[PDB]
Amino acid sequence: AKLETVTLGNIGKDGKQTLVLNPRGVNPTNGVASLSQAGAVPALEKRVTVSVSQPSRNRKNYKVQVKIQNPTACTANGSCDPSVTRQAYADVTFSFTQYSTDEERAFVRTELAALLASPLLIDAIDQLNPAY
């Protein structure tokens, strides 16, 4: 996987907004690739981190983990720089054994992306009311 620019069209509630993300390199302590918002100022931009973890003597199986965060900026009065008011998170962790095939993991990925567009999840996430 080559870290490139990621363009996401037709996202948001109305299906009109886009999002262009630029790579920010891997973190050599923990191997987590990062991506941020085009434009920016740092500590006010939308971040996407992706890591992939290999089994060792501590953990038996593979683990793919995605953590995305994005803040809300409020321009205060008498100030020249906006501040972060609240933040919204999401983080997916996939766990797969060492004998899983390609079709299975593509099925889990595609099942999750298809479930994030069902009215069960549209009504669980946008409005915060569970299934009755």
Applying CB under 8 A, the residues found at the interface with another protein are 1-2, 4-10, 13-16, 22, 114, 117-120, 122-123
Q: Is residue 16 part of the contact set for its own copies (CB under 8 A)?
A: no
Smallest distance from another protein to CB 10, Å: 7
- Our CB check for another protein shows the closer of 18 and 83 to be 18
Smallest distance from its own copies to CB 27, Å: 5
In the numeric block, which tokens belong to residue 48?
């996407």
Q: Is residue 20 part of the contact set for its own copies (CB under 8 A)?
A: no
Q: Are 8 and 25 in contact (CB under 8 A)?
A: no
Q: Which of residues 77-116 bind its own copies (CB under 8 A)?
A: 77-83, 85-116
Smallest distance from another protein to CB 92, Å: 17
> Residue with structure tokens 């009215």?
119
Write down the number of H helices and E strands in the chain. 2, 6
State CA 89 to chain mean position distance. Answer: 8
CA distance 72 to 85: 6
CA distance 21 to 8: 8
What binding mask, one character per residue, do residues 26-65 give for its own copies by CB under 8 A, x or -?
xxxxxx-xxxx-xxxxxxx--xx-xxx-xx-xxxx-x-x-
